[PDB]
């Protein structure tokens, strides 16, 4: 259909779902594929090939459920997979206060141009990784501007 409409709906869906999870300290890990493919990491998860919504993203990460333990990977206009493996960064610069989801988000950002969003189950803070860099505990305004810049062409 109309790509700009799809891209803005994707941004809204990430914003609403991460707001919901952040308030409840639900851990989450959502990686959005870009020019470089993520197909090999999609293959490690449970296939969904589903329409993007804030509601599905939230339902996926509910603790102690079949789909929660790993990354969601979004490819084109679909939630491709849940519970996917991402490579862990070995960087010693990542703070030891951060958990596996952050190290996974950092790891995938070091080998793809994907944009990955994390919700910390410890703090509720929202972080983002891109190109081997971490943007830690961003405000709602900051998250919106980054997602606009990176996900809207
Ligand atoms: N908990 C985790 N979530 C996603 N990718 C991972 N790779 C290793 N541990 C992981
Ligand atoms: Cl069209
Ligand atoms: Cl966490």
UniProtKB/Swiss-Prot annotation:
The reported result of mutating residue 100 to N is: No c-di-AMP formation (construct without residues 1-80)
Q: Which domain of life is it from?
A: Bacteria
What are the residue boundaries of the DAC domain, all occurrences included?
1-140
Q: Which UniProt keywords apply?
A: ATP-binding, Cell membrane, Membrane, Nucleotide-binding, Nucleotidyltransferase, Transferase, Transmembrane, Transmembrane helix
Kindly give the membrane topology term recorded for this protein.
Multi-pass membrane protein
Give the disruption phenotype, in one or two sentences: Essential, it cannot be deleted.
Instruction: Identify the cofactor(s).
Output: Co(2+)
Please give the name of this protein: Diadenylate cyclase
Query: What organism is recorded for this protein?
Result: Listeria monocytogenes serovar 1/2a (strain ATCC BAA-679 / EGD-e)
Gene name, per UniProt, is dacA
- Interval of the full protein contained in this chain: 103 to 255 of 273
